[PDB]
Amino acid sequence: KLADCSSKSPEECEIFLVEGDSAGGSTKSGRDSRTQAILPLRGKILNVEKARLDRILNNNEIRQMITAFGTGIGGDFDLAKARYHKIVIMTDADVDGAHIRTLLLTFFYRFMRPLIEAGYVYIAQPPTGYKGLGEMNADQLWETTMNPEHRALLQVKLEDAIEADQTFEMLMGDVVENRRQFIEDNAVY
Amino acid sequence: KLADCSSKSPEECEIFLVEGDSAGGSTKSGRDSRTQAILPLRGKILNVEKARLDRILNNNEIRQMITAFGTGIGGDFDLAKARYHKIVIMTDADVDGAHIRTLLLTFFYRFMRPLIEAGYVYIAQPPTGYKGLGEMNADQLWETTMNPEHRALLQVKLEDAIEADQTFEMLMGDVVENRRQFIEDNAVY
Amino acid sequence: NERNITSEMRESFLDYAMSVIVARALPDVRDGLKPVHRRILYGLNEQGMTPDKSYKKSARIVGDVMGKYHPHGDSSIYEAMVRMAQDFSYRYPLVDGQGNFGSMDGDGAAAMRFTEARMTKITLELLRDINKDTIDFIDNYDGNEREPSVLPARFPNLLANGASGIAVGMATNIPPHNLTELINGVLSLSKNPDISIAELMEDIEGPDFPTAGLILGKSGIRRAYETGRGSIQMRSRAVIEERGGGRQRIVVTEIPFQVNKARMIEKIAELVRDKKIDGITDLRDETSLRTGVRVVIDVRKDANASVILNNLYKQTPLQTSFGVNMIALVNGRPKLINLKEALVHYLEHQKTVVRRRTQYNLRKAKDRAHILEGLRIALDHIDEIISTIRESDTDKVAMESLQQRFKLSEKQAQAILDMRLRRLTGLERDKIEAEYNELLNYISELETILADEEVLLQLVRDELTEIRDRFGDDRRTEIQL
Amino acid sequence: INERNITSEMRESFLDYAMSVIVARALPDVRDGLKPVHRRILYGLNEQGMTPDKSYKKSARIVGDVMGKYHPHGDSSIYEAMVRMAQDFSYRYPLVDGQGNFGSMDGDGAAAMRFTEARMTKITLELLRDINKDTIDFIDNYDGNEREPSVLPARFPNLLANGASGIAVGMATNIPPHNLTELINGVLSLSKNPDISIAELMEDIEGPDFPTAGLILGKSGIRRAYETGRGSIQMRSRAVIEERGGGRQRIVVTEIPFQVNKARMIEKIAELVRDKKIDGITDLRDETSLRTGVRVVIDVRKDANASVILNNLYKQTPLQTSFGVNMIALVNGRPKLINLKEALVHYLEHQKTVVRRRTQYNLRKAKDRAHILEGLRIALDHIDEIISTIRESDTDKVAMESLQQRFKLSEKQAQAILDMRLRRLTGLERDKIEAEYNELLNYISELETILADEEVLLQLVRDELTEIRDRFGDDRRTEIQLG
DNA sequence: TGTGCGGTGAACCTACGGCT
DNA sequence: AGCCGTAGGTTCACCGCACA
Ligand SMILES: O=c1ccc2ccc(F)c3c2n1C[C@H]3CN1CCC(NCc2cc3c(nn2)OCCO3)CC1
Ligand SMILES: [Mn+2]
Ligand SMILES: [Mn+2]
């Protein structure tokens, strides 16, 4: 499933995570296969904050990402074995894409936390007004979102480890009420 | 995948063969579940004339038909073990449905020939003007094609074995020339 | 160029949470619809797929809805449309479908290329006068189309068909109701703003499921009507009968709402095999299109079939509870509403719709009258009218002369010029006059309605009463003490 | 209808399926070069005004209208068929304009139809040009609720230009694409010499021209194919040998053979190195980019002969693949094996028929218009009389009858006077009508002139063909090396 | 633990000719 | 061998909440 790049020097390599093959096509045609790797998934991924340890390790998409990064998870994590110095989350520019980002972020924080601390995780910024990346022409996706010259990548930074633990538990955790309260307090119509 | 009937008396029981679930849905809703079994297949079935035994015995649709009839194949074929006395081919009323009927008959002739000789194989006559059975309402399918009081079923007859052996070779066999010659000599444009 | 992980999580998840709440899983209190359902119905309306017309292709319907209004998966759109056509899911179906549309056994519908659909006669009541400026239109997802924000909904659809929705941080579960009871309830409310739940319950006895069946007690219904939350125990319609000689059987002809019949049966078989239940010698689904739902459960000779039945209620979905949780969008926001609140918001929506329609009919009537007054002047001085046009080199000069000489507006002058020669015949000249007089009475009739709030409210009552008589039916679900 | 003989059933069901595939699915028509699926697509795009000047229209809507009205088959067959016509690596002259993910040479499928949008290409307008001027025969659709075209005007030789490949029953077809400038020149020489030979035609049409460029080896295979309709043509990738540093060399491929999957070709090359069925290769990379273009790199080991490795690669991998020409196409609704001339002949006859039927249509339309104008002239000259005649009439029927007898008018002339608006009575309309009528008389004469002389009609086809050539004709892409 | 319903996402059979 | 391209067919991963 992973469409890897030419170079094997992680310092200059990057891996874009997309929603699927409809998006993956525009991505593969528009990239630089020398330094830009692409791993298309299959939509909404497993929520690690609600699922059991054994279920997570058996999940097909979860394994592909770990195999792609080559660092292992939890206690067996090793940053020196990282295959890419830039893991780029590039979901579709819609509400369901924003949700998938949170799902991936949740995954990176609970099993590959040091990857976020080292500044390896990035958030791509595709243009609004597109239902998906498969709706865009290869060139317009490259110039606006993937081209190192003109793209605005957002680096994920971890500030407070206490506030972060409370955020992921609140939004992605098994307790509904806390999540309902958050919505009530922050909702703007 | 088989949707069986209540009765276990094969003399009064019958099994309908349809192209898939879209056709199977209208069929299950309009049938008499006491004596009418339903086996939805998966579109175009393997042409046994061009395939070798290993390929045949491992095809899902072939296996389910064999399992459903309960007669066995070739030299092990036992007519006394049939679960239905009416095997009804009810493919869609289009040119591709006609082709699946030829592919089914081919299979029945090469592996369940005595089943035909006993007059156990029939041909349904759904009305034309429909792309598939799924396009018809359950009652319309029942009254015109499935209800024994009104339906017209075509019983398959074997006249000359020698000519039948040649016809199955010419049309379904691997030699394209004979098949091209047949088309030329009989095509009326 | 830098993004804090805590902020990203809070903003993106809120963005998604809000969207599902206000534009996906929760229905509006006014039309009782979700965005996908409203977009499907509107699509059928704009394409003129009315019940008098022939069945249109599901593929074209879904294809148009997706492109014009619903920027989502085609499978979601198609499956929502199919559900609206199922007489076991919708108390008052909204889609009239041709072909395979699924079963109570969980079988899906045939691929969209094979099926065809149109509106039911009742759906016309949801769309009635949607083009008479009754409801507010909004921009679609891309600025290229226009879509309704809500439907006229000339019958209380939210409570009639109910709704189920899983969102974020909340969910919804509203049961369907009998239309005759709802409208009667609405009529009482309009005559008494201070009516109580207890009194409204004299009209609305409780939920009415498309799959009939039984409800046990009035406590669960009362709790739900009062608070918006409550547990209602549903039960299958089951009888015990002889089958000879000395042996008995349990016959089921109605199952609980939303219960899969095939699934229910397997669950019974599982218990028999696992020896978790005693006395069952045979289990057959005799259901027929012709004979209706019929599930037969053979009992062992001399065993008490009444004891076996009671056990089936405890261990199988033969008895299932419906947990009411009435959350709907009120003024755009999710809210837990009681029976009265729901009826109040619907009544108030009906008043605005009828007033807006009257105001629209008035404006258009006046505009037409003005145009007719122009043509009437023209017919009275047709000779003079010709001479003015004949001596004019251009249309612009003709216009200006017509306005000048006959003291006409710009619109009146244009209408005379657009007038064809055939309009001059005996019968045609009489049509222009006949229409004008009818229109003056009409204008007067509409002004009488706007000048009195009580007359308007009475019209709302009379129009609701008309629908009750035509679409109202009998209660299906039995409520036992 | 109690019984059915198995043999009779097999023959009559099978021939029915086979006939349908042959005449209504897998084989292209010699006149417009299209299979029903594609013709129905282009027609659907035309009926909804999905022209190049208009914005892109949603793919799902396209597929859905085509499926419902003309093509009663699965949506995937329709979509994927539209997708192909939009690819510059599949169609020498694309017929569809696409926005979004529309596949790749690496075998990637297009994005789901909900994401993509499409429209007609400028060259497609030429296929549909004059379709609404009674140039081609329309027929009832599959259910009888719609009308569709049996063939398109095809103002350019589409069959040979874009070619085709189809697998039917009892037969198959494989027609390679060609250069439009070359094709039109051939058609021109043919229209000037019915006895023109194949060898003489090849002075214009040098051989196939693939959207993927590349090379062709020899002319014998090409000659055989044109002469008989069958032949084996050797396609070869464009590859060069260049230096990479330190006395080491590499092979660089910038163009591959038609219909060859790039990723799949590369994988087979990697398989040979891994299984040791070829030596001298140290690395294999695919450096293809939008900016760079197709670029496959094959690093050779220092001191190894790179030309030998290249030669082996041609023999052992699809880096050199043959195109088996088998030119079967529908001629009067029958499948027929045709040569280069016979293809050009049937196309030219289609063009002669289209342009003639067009001139005949314009002639009827003009005579009808001149007839109406005569009725309007009488009306305006005696307007007062006309107006009183209408006013004194109670119904429309009465007015029509009075107008016909009093003013010597036909039923159509009287009707057009009644449909006439009051603004048509202005002071300059009477002269405006007189001008149009005079122009029409002159125009009618010009059309009759053409239909009375076969040489003026044929020359007209030539001019319109030449016009297509100059506006859409391009340079040859595939290089033919000898030998 | 599994289900109801609008959402994100995608795969792999087969026929056919030629080479609570 | 499979693979070129129009055809017939369909299955299973995930989210979210509240009920037994
Ligand atoms: O990816 C996968 C992977 C596996 C798999 C298995 C079984 C299975 F069934 C399927 C699978 N899939 C996909 C799915 C098969 N698809 C094919 C195409 C079919 N098209 C619908 C459609 C769309 C339209 C339209 N009409 N009809 O017109 C209006 C706009 O768009 C929808 C089902
Ligand atoms: Mn997406
Ligand atoms: Mn079919």
Coordinates of all heavy atoms in Angstrom, one line a residue, chain C residues 309-347:
Chain C
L309 N -43.7 -18.6 26.0 CA -43.9 -17.2 25.5 C -43.3 -16.2 26.4 O -42.5 -15.4 25.9 CB -45.4 -17.0 25.2 CG -45.9 -15.6 24.6 CD1 -45.3 -15.4 23.2 CD2 -47.4 -15.6 24.6
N310 N -43.7 -16.2 27.7 CA -43.1 -15.3 28.7 C -41.6 -15.3 28.7 O -41.0 -14.3 28.9 CB -43.7 -15.6 30.1 CG -45.2 -15.3 30.1 OD1 -45.8 -14.6 29.3 ND2 -45.9 -16.0 31.1
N311 N -41.0 -16.5 28.6 CA -39.6 -16.7 28.6 C -39.0 -16.1 27.3 O -37.9 -15.5 27.4 CB -39.2 -18.2 28.6 CG -39.5 -18.8 30.0 OD1 -39.7 -18.1 31.0 ND2 -39.4 -20.1 30.1
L312 N -39.7 -16.2 26.2 CA -39.2 -15.6 24.9 C -39.2 -14.1 25.0 O -38.3 -13.4 24.4 CB -40.1 -16.1 23.7 CG -40.0 -17.5 23.2 CD1 -41.1 -17.8 22.2 CD2 -38.6 -17.8 22.6
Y313 N -40.1 -13.5 25.8 CA -40.1 -12.0 26.0 C -38.9 -11.6 26.7 O -38.4 -10.5 26.5 CB -41.4 -11.6 26.7 CG -42.7 -11.7 25.8 CD1 -43.9 -12.2 26.4 CD2 -42.7 -11.1 24.6 CE1 -45.0 -12.2 25.6 CE2 -43.9 -11.2 23.8 CZ -45.0 -11.7 24.3 OH -46.1 -11.7 23.5
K314 N -38.5 -12.4 27.7 CA -37.4 -12.1 28.6 C -36.0 -12.2 27.9 O -35.1 -11.5 28.2 CB -37.4 -12.9 29.8 CG -38.6 -12.8 30.7 CD -38.5 -13.9 31.8 CE -39.7 -13.8 32.8 NZ -39.6 -14.9 33.8
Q315 N -35.9 -13.3 27.0 CA -34.6 -13.6 26.4 C -34.4 -13.3 24.9 O -33.3 -13.4 24.4 CB -34.3 -15.1 26.6 CG -34.7 -15.6 28.0 CD -34.5 -17.1 28.1 OE1 -33.4 -17.6 27.9 NE2 -35.5 -17.8 28.5
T316 N -35.5 -12.9 24.2 CA -35.3 -12.6 22.8 C -35.9 -11.2 22.5 O -36.7 -10.7 23.3 CB -36.0 -13.6 21.9 OG1 -37.5 -13.5 22.0 CG2 -35.7 -15.0 22.3
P317 N -35.5 -10.6 21.4 CA -36.1 -9.3 21.0 C -37.6 -9.3 20.7 O -38.2 -8.3 20.3 CB -35.4 -8.9 19.7 CG -34.1 -9.7 19.8 CD -34.5 -11.0 20.4
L318 N -38.3 -10.4 21.1 CA -39.8 -10.5 21.0 C -40.4 -9.4 21.8 O -41.6 -9.1 21.6 CB -40.2 -11.9 21.4 CG -41.6 -12.4 21.0 CD1 -41.6 -12.7 19.5 CD2 -41.8 -13.7 21.8
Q319 N -39.7 -9.0 22.8 CA -40.0 -7.8 23.6 C -38.8 -7.0 23.5 O -37.7 -7.4 23.9 CB -40.4 -8.2 25.0 CG -40.7 -7.1 26.0 CD -41.3 -7.5 27.3 OE1 -41.9 -8.5 27.4 NE2 -41.1 -6.6 28.3
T320 N -38.9 -5.7 23.1 CA -37.8 -4.8 23.0 C -38.3 -3.5 23.5 O -39.4 -3.1 23.3 CB -37.2 -4.7 21.6 OG1 -36.9 -6.0 21.0 CG2 -36.0 -3.9 21.5
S321 N -37.4 -2.8 24.2 CA -37.8 -1.4 24.7 C -37.3 -0.3 23.7 O -36.2 -0.4 23.1 CB -37.3 -1.2 26.1 OG -35.9 -1.4 26.2
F322 N -38.1 0.7 23.6 CA -37.8 1.9 22.8 C -37.4 3.0 23.8 O -38.3 3.5 24.5 CB -38.9 2.3 21.9 CG -38.6 3.4 21.0 CD1 -38.2 3.2 19.6 CD2 -38.7 4.7 21.4 CE1 -37.9 4.2 18.8 CE2 -38.4 5.8 20.5 CZ -38.0 5.5 19.2
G323 N -36.2 3.4 23.8 CA -35.7 4.4 24.7 C -35.8 5.8 24.1 O -35.0 6.2 23.4
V324 N -36.9 6.5 24.4 CA -37.2 7.9 23.9 C -36.2 8.9 24.4 O -35.8 8.9 25.6 CB -38.6 8.3 24.3 CG1 -38.8 9.8 23.8 CG2 -39.7 7.4 23.7
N325 N -35.7 9.7 23.5 CA -34.7 10.8 23.7 C -35.0 11.8 22.7 O -34.3 11.8 21.6 CB -33.3 10.2 23.7 CG -32.2 11.2 24.1 OD1 -31.1 11.1 23.7 ND2 -32.6 12.2 24.9
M326 N -35.9 12.7 23.0 CA -36.4 13.7 22.0 C -35.5 14.9 21.9 O -35.8 16.0 22.4 CB -37.9 14.1 22.2 CG -38.8 12.9 21.9 SD -40.5 13.4 21.7 CE -40.9 14.1 23.4
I327 N -34.4 14.8 21.1 CA -33.6 15.9 20.8 C -33.7 16.3 19.3 O -33.7 15.5 18.4 CB -32.1 15.6 21.1 CG1 -31.9 15.5 22.6 CG2 -31.2 16.7 20.5 CD1 -30.5 15.2 23.1
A328 N -34.0 17.6 19.1 CA -34.2 18.2 17.8 C -33.6 19.5 17.7 O -33.2 20.1 18.7 CB -35.7 18.3 17.5
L329 N -33.4 20.1 16.5 CA -32.8 21.4 16.3 C -33.9 22.4 16.5 O -34.8 22.4 15.7 CB -32.1 21.4 15.0 CG -30.9 20.5 14.9 CD1 -30.5 20.5 13.4 CD2 -29.8 20.8 15.8
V330 N -33.8 23.2 17.5 CA -34.7 24.3 17.7 C -34.0 25.6 17.5 O -33.1 25.8 18.2 CB -35.4 24.3 19.1 CG1 -36.4 25.4 19.2 CG2 -36.0 22.9 19.3
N331 N -34.4 26.4 16.6 CA -33.7 27.6 16.3 C -32.2 27.3 16.1 O -31.3 28.0 16.5 CB -33.9 28.7 17.4 CG -33.2 30.0 17.1 OD1 -33.4 30.6 16.1 ND2 -32.4 30.5 18.1
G332 N -32.0 26.2 15.4 CA -30.7 25.8 15.1 C -30.0 25.1 16.2 O -28.8 24.9 16.1
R333 N -30.3 25.0 17.3 CA -29.5 24.4 18.3 C -30.2 23.1 18.8 O -31.4 23.0 18.8 CB -29.4 25.4 19.4 CG -28.6 26.6 19.1 CD -28.7 27.6 20.2 NE -27.9 27.1 21.4 CZ -27.4 27.8 22.3 NH1 -27.4 29.2 22.2 NH2 -26.7 27.3 23.3
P334 N -29.3 22.1 19.2 CA -29.9 20.8 19.8 C -30.6 21.1 21.1 O -30.0 21.8 22.0 CB -28.6 20.0 20.0 CG -27.5 21.0 20.1 CD -27.9 22.1 19.2
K335 N -31.7 20.5 21.3 CA -32.5 20.7 22.5 C -33.4 19.5 22.9 O -33.9 18.9 22.0 CB -33.3 22.0 22.4 CG -33.8 22.5 23.7 CD -34.9 23.6 23.5 CE -35.1 24.4 24.8 NZ -36.0 23.5 25.7
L336 N -33.5 19.2 24.1 CA -34.3 18.2 24.6 C -35.7 18.8 24.8 O -35.9 19.7 25.6 CB -33.8 17.6 26.0 CG -34.5 16.4 26.6 CD1 -34.6 15.2 25.7 CD2 -33.9 16.0 27.9
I337 N -36.7 18.3 24.0 CA -38.0 18.8 24.0 C -39.1 17.8 24.5 O -38.9 16.6 24.3 CB -38.4 19.4 22.6 CG1 -38.3 18.3 21.5 CG2 -37.6 20.6 22.3 CD1 -38.8 18.7 20.2
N338 N -40.2 18.3 25.1 CA -41.3 17.5 25.5 C -42.4 17.5 24.4 O -42.3 18.4 23.5 CB -41.8 17.9 26.9 CG -42.4 19.3 26.9 OD1 -43.3 19.6 26.1 ND2 -41.8 20.1 27.8
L339 N -43.4 16.7 24.5 CA -44.4 16.6 23.5 C -45.0 18.0 23.2 O -45.1 18.4 22.0 CB -45.6 15.7 24.0 CG -46.8 15.6 23.1 CD1 -46.5 15.0 21.7 CD2 -47.9 14.7 23.7
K340 N -45.3 18.8 24.2 CA -45.8 20.2 24.0 C -44.9 21.1 23.3 O -45.3 21.8 22.3 CB -46.3 20.8 25.3 CG -47.0 22.2 25.1 CD -47.6 22.8 26.4 CE -48.3 24.1 26.1 NZ -48.9 24.7 27.3
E341 N -43.6 21.2 23.7 CA -42.6 22.0 23.0 C -42.6 21.7 21.5 O -42.6 22.6 20.7 CB -41.2 21.9 23.6 CG -41.1 22.2 25.1 CD -39.7 22.0 25.6 OE1 -38.7 22.7 25.1 OE2 -39.4 21.1 26.5
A342 N -42.5 20.4 21.2 CA -42.5 20.0 19.8 C -43.7 20.4 19.0 O -43.6 20.9 17.9 CB -42.4 18.4 19.7
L343 N -44.9 20.3 19.7 CA -46.2 20.7 19.1 C -46.2 22.3 18.9 O -46.7 22.8 17.9 CB -47.4 20.2 19.8 CG -47.6 18.7 19.9 CD1 -48.8 18.4 20.8 CD2 -47.9 18.1 18.5
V344 N -45.6 23.0 19.9 CA -45.6 24.4 19.9 C -44.8 25.0 18.7 O -45.3 25.7 17.9 CB -45.2 25.1 21.2 CG1 -44.9 26.6 21.1 CG2 -46.3 24.8 22.2
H345 N -43.5 24.5 18.6 CA -42.7 24.9 17.5 C -43.3 24.6 16.1 O -43.2 25.4 15.2 CB -41.3 24.3 17.6 CG -40.5 24.8 18.8 ND1 -40.1 26.1 19.0 CD2 -40.1 24.1 20.0 CE1 -39.5 26.2 20.2 NE2 -39.5 25.1 20.8
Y346 N -43.9 23.4 16.0 CA -44.5 23.1 14.7 C -45.7 24.0 14.4 O -45.9 24.5 13.3 CB -45.0 21.6 14.6 CG -45.7 21.3 13.4 CD1 -45.1 21.2 12.1 CD2 -47.1 21.3 13.4 CE1 -45.8 21.0 11.0 CE2 -47.9 21.0 12.2 CZ -47.2 20.9 11.0 OH -47.9 20.7 9.9
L347 N -46.5 24.3 15.4 CA -47.7 25.2 15.2 C -47.2 26.6 14.8 O -47.7 27.1 13.8 CB -48.6 25.3 16.4 CG -49.8 26.2 16.3 CD1 -50.8 25.8 15.2 CD2 -50.6 26.2 17.6

